[PDB]
RNA sequence: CUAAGAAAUUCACGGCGGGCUUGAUGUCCGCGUCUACCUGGUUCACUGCCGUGUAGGCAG
């Protein structure tokens, strides 16, 4: 018996597009009304400071190229000059039961995966993965470049049942560390709530409110809208920021990628900090191919070893595999 | 067109940032001119050199 | 059984120097607005001396 070839693990822990507004610190308690940060426009005259060749380039050509300016046009977004706090608000559906997919060839593989995910729900419900998701919510990983340089970052997490509240935590993202993962009673409570929310025990819907003193007038960093620019259609414009209806927003993909930094046992290194959890797991910015497929430590070959040969490595690799299936994606080519 | 914000005339942030980093006094030409801005291929483009 | 399935995609920046917009002018002529009226609106379903617990007689 072989396994299914067309498989589609689905999205789970879906965050919303984070909207940004701006106001003053210590009046953040009664703040549901702050005006949105909007993407402004300005012009740039710069030099050319990139690396330049010494072969097949004329001396007069590079003398004419360095000494002539570059006049591009970019987008920015700043806080107002009397507002020193970047508010970031988003919601987070926690669905439940990310084990089984909904695209399967083999019925025997599908209920076999149901057998092993019911085994994992039986012996221990989602505890350390819930710890790591609740701790990424606890600090400000969703604040990417908004985090560094801030003197005070607060995370407030409310839970939704009806037009009312169920619990109101309060997390100090400066006091809560960045690298070494610990556990505390509020973090235990949030990890327990979404621990119920992950194993299909019902419906969990959260909304997270963040605050950050940066300083009045400073640069915020919404995400960047992409463009191909392959050859022709060069353009007067660069740095297209991302927006919604009249506000500066962060993509769902990148705040989800901020939620999915779990793996501390990748085989390349273990003291540099965690990386992003994905098959062929390697962060995009570094470019170094972490989690080489020629070892047994993929999601592909490891799932093929774990569902046919019925053997197992240590429990942390299974935490990585269960984080892969909570992540979603494609198994097989 | 002059740069502005809501109801206020403004200087860009990078113009102030350029005026802060005018430090370099060891470009190999001379000390007769003075400090220029720190830059790779350190170029005062406003005088074309 | 949602054209099924899924995705960090980026870091840096000096726009600037200069200028004569000016000359001249007829907005005109004429006109019918008129008929009738209940604000008691409660101008807070309320303001005050007996004990600051529903515990009192006034042209309220």
Helix (H, G, I), strand (E, B) or coil at A1: coil
Backbone angles phi, psi at B23, to 5 degrees: -120, -45
Dihedral sign of CA atoms B41, B45, B48, B49 in order: negative
3 state SS of A177: coil
Cα angle value A102/A279/A301 (rounded, 5°):
90
Burial of B17 (0-12, 13-18, 19+ CB in 10 A): exposed
The residue among B32, B25, A148 whose CA lies nearest residue B42 is: B25
**What span, in angstroms and rounded, lies between the C-alpha atoms of B39 and B30?**
17
What 3-state DSSP class applies to A320? Answer: helix
- B49 CB contact with strand C at below 7 Å: no
In total, the C-beta contacts within 8 angstroms joining chain A to chain B are: 24
DSSP string, chain B: ---EETTEE---HHHHHHHH-EEE---SS-SSS--EE--TT---GGGT-
Tokens coding A200 = 């299909």
State residue A222 phi and psi, 5-degree precision: -70, 160
Alpha carbons A81 and A216: distance in angstroms, whole number: 5
Instruction: Inspect the interface and report whether the beta carbons of B45 and A68 lie closer than 8 Å.
Output: yes
Are A258 and A304 in contact by the 8 Å Cβ rule? The answer is no
Token pair for A130: 């819930």
A285 Cα distance to chain centroid: 14
Residues A258, A15: Cα–Cα separation, whole Å: 10
DSSP, res A237: B
Give the sign of the dihedral formed by CA A41, CA A46, CA A51, CA A57: positive
Residues across chain A: 333
Contact B48 A40 (CB under 8 A): no
Chain A positions touching B21 (Cβ under 8 A) are: none
Contact A67 B43 (CB under 8 A): yes
Q: How far apart are CA A127 and CA A133, in angstroms?
A: 10
* Residues 1-40 of chain B sitting with CB below 7 angstroms of strand C: 12, 14-15, 17-18, 37, 39
Q: Which pairing describes strands A40-46 and A70-76: parallel, antiparallel, or unpaired?
A: antiparallel
**Where in chain A are the domains?**
1-10+98-125+262-333, 11-97+126-261
**Partner-chain residue, chosen from B3, B40, B48, that has the shortest CB–CB distance to A67:** B48
CA distance A33 to A40: 21
DSSP-derived 3-state class of residue A106: coil
* Contacts (Cβ under 8 Å, ≥6 apart) of A65: A48, A52
């Amino acid at each position: 018996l072989s396994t299914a070839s067309v498989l589609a693990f689905e999205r789970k822990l879906d965050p919303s597009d984070a909207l940004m507004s701006a106001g003053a610190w210590a009046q953040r308690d009664a703040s549901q009304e702050w005006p949105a940060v909007t993407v402004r426009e300005k012009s740039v005259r710069g030099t050319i400071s990139n690396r330049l060749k010494t072969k097949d380039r004329d001396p007069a050509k590079l003398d004419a190229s360095i000494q002539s300016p570059n006049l591009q046009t970019v987008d920015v977004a700043n806080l107002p000059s009397d507002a020193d706090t970047l508010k970031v608000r988003f919601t987070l559906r926690v669905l439940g039961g990310a084990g089984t997919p909904s695209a399967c060839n083999d019925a025997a593989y599908r209920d076999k995966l149901l057998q092993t995910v019911a085994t994992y729900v039986n012996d221990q419900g989602f505890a350390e993965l819930a710890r790591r998701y609740a701790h990424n919510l606890a600090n400000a990983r969703f604040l990417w470049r908004n985090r560094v340089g801030a003197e005070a970052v607060e995370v407030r997490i409310n839970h939704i049942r009806q037009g009312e509240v169920a619990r109101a935590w309060r997390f100090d993202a400066l006091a809560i560390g960045l690298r070494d993962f610990k556990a505390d009673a509020e973090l235990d409570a949030l990890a327990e709530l979404i621990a119920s929310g992950l194993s299909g025990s019902g419906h969990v819907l959260l909304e997270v409110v963040a605050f950050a003193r940066i300083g009045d007038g400073q640069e915020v960093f919404p995400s960047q809208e992409l463009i191909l620019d392959k050859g022709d259609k060069k353009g007067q414009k660069s740095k297209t920021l991302y927006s919604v209806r009249d506000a500066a927003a962060i993509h769902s993909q990148k705040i989800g990628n901020a939620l999915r930094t779990i793996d501390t046992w990748y085989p390349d290194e273990d003291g540099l900090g965690p990386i992003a959890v994905e098959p062929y797991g390697s962060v995009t910015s570094q470019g170094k191919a972490y989690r080489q497929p020629k070892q047994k430590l993929d999601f592909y070959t490891l799932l093929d070893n774990w569902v046919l040969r019925d053997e197992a490595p240590a429990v942390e690799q299974q935490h990585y595999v269960i984080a892969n299936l909570i992540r979603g994606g494609v198994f097989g080519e």
